[PDB]
Amino acid sequence: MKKQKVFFATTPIYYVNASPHIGHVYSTLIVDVLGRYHRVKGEEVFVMTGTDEHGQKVAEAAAKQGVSPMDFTTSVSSEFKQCFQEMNYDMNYFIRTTNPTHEKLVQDIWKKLAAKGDIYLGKYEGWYSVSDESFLTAQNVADGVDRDGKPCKVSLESGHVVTWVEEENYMFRLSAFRERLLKYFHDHPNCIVPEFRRREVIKTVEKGLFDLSISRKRESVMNWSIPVPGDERHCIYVWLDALFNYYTGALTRVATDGTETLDEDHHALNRWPADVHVVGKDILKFHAIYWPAFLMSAELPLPERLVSHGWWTKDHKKISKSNAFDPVEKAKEFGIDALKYFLMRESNFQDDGDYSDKNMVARLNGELADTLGNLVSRCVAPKINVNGMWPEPAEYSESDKTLIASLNNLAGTVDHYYCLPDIQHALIAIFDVLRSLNAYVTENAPWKLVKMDTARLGTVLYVTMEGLRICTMFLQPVMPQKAKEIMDALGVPEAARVGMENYLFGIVKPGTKIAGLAEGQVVFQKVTLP
């Protein structure tokens, strides 16, 4: 009576100094796809996102607009929740670091790290940037000019003003975890993807680590941060607070009235540790080195997999309102599912993808309409499927059996890619089979069979429709509205859409009614390039 661990995947929790943009939408889509695939696989799933709400920069922003920090972060937090509703994401849980359960948990974790002997009182001497919430070395700082045009120092990474600090702070003995980290990496060859970002991280740890500041003075962050337990002069640094959101989520019990309590430990909810943490390549180091070290100190199971991804450009340039890239607009223009497909198909996680209307139309026209939408039309066409039902197959030929084999072989390939995870190659493998299905319909010419060989027609349509069901089931994670549109048109019963029992050829009963497409209804239609 042992249960499988719940599938648990996370987005980063996002800063609330800006409205949701393409970066947050891409990270959340990746996680939404993984979650949806593991529900299609019939597993228990818990995927989470949320907002990173503490620190000086938020306090100064809430002052500027004369509302309380809590009021400012509630409002920006609500914009993230609204964006993720508009994008048709299925997040199980949306965390805020202002949540009392989270703020208590970070203090409990602080006490665990201290009780282990991993915290000491030291002193930072060097540069800090409120706007980056980051400590900087001398080689990452340069001359610039402040709001008043006075010569000053600036971040080479962000352009922001660099306040110099000579200040006591609590510290974490990261230097002590070098060997424990190298052995985690060595015993877990897939703990980081892509595999090369893993080699680069191993080398960073081999060069040795410095100890981390994990506090700032309460005055610095205007009391908008979690107090250090037992030393109210200091507040817990925003990154330590933020990283432990994933653990808070793993412990979070949500009653049917929406009230949230934390379990005492992770075992009963059976989510921890994460199957996948999804992050932008800029926060990879924090999740690959610092985060496991904190978890080692806290004696918690370590993450299974860290997945990093790139940043989108627009029109080979570099996104700037002055091109702009509003994914909510591009979804109104082309269709939400066509945009989700493009973002998951066009680039791998190693690369910085480039959006252009030209490449968007090439994939919508050439793959979604030409391959998938046209195959659906062919299967539910009244002139081809006269009875509007799944026919009885007759004897399969060698040709028929070659295709059935590729249908049975598809789940292994697609499951392997979704679990890697490599969503781009899952999609390529599904579309290889959708292209095969169109060639198979063409080769068999049902337009002839319908007035010549009813029995052979029954075979060709049964195989094609089963093929289409299998491919569509594996597209539900990426294009959930269009996938449902296809399953409804085909008359695939609800129970046949999800679960590993549906991963093989020959599920749907001959005599099942197809619903078809209504008169003006095309699943994907080619468009012009403007």
Ligand X SMILES: COC(=O)CNc1nc(Nc2ccc(F)c(F)c2)nc2c1cnn2C
Binding residues: 54, 103
The residue among 34, 19, 38, 39 whose CA lies nearest residue 84 is: 19
Q: Does 91 bind ligand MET (CB under 6 A)?
A: no
Cβ-based nearer residue to ligand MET, 23 or 516:
23
Q: Does 418 bind ligand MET (CB under 6 A)?
A: no
Contact 83, 97 (CB under 8 A): no
Q: How far is the CB of 239 from ligand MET (least distance, A)?
A: 7
Q: How far apart are CA 19 and CA 72, in angstroms?
A: 12
Name residue 460's amino acid. Answer: V
Cβ-based nearer residue to ligand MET, 39 or 57:
57
Q: Which residues are annotated as a binding site for Zn(2+)?
A: 54, 103
| Torsions phi, psi for 501 (to 5 deg) | -65, -20
Neighbours of 27 (CB within 10 A): 20
Q: Does 13 bind ligand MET (CB under 6 A)?
A: yes
Cβ-based nearer residue to ligand X, 106 or 496:
106
The residue among 525, 51, 58, 127 whose CA lies nearest residue 334 is: 525
Q: Binding marks (x or -) toward ligand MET, 35..74, rule CB under 6 A?
A: -----------------x----------------------
With CB under 6 A, what is the number of residues at the site for ligand X?
Answer: 13
Q: Among the residues of 65-217, which ranges form H helices? A: 69-86, 100-116, 178-187, 195-206
Contact 46, 6 (CB under 8 A): yes
Q: Binding marks (x or -) toward ligand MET, 151..180, rule CB under 6 A?
A: ------------------------------
Q: How far is the CB of 422 from ligand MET (least distance, A)?
A: 23
> Residue 407: is it exposed, middle or buried by C-beta count within 10 angstroms (0-12/13-18/19+)?
buried
- Selection from ligand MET, ligand X, none that 12 binds (CB < 5 to 8 A by kind) is ligand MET
Strands 163-172 and 212-213: antiparallel
Q: How far is the CB of 510 from ligand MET (least distance, A)?
A: 51
| Residue among 110, 127, 237, 355 that touches ligand X (CB under 6 A) | 237
Q: How far apart are CA 71 and CA 488, in angstroms?
A: 44
Of the chain, the end-to-end C-alpha distance in Å amounts to: 59
Contact 527, 365 (CB under 8 A): yes
The residue among 483, 348, 470 whose CA lies nearest residue 414 is: 470
Q: Provide DSSP, 235-281.
A: EE-HHHHHHTHHHHHHHEEE-TTS-EEE-SSSTTTT-PSPSEEEEEG
Q: Binding marks (x or -) toward ligand X, 18..57, rule CB under 6 A?
A: ----------------------------------------
The residue among 22, 36, 311 whose CA lies nearest residue 9 is: 36
DSSP three-state, residue 170: strand
Cβ-based nearer residue to ligand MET, 231 or 352:
352
Cβ-based nearer residue to ligand X, 240 or 475:
240
Contacts of ligand X in 92-151 (CB under 6 A): 124, 134-135
Q: How far is the CB of 16 from ligand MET (least distance, A)?
A: 9
Cβ-based nearer residue to ligand X, 279 or 465:
279
Contacts of ligand MET in 241-300 (CB under 6 A): 242-243, 245, 283
Q: Does 15 bind ligand X (CB under 6 A)?
A: no
Name residue 406's amino acid. Answer: S
| Residue among 14, 172, 184, 505 that touches ligand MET (CB under 6 A) | 14
Q: Does 97 bind ligand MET (CB under 6 A)?
A: no
Chain residues in the site for ligand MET (CB under 6 A): 12-15, 52, 242-243, 245, 283
- Contact residues for ligand X, defined by CB under 6 A: 124, 134-135, 210, 212-214, 237, 239-240, 243, 286, 290
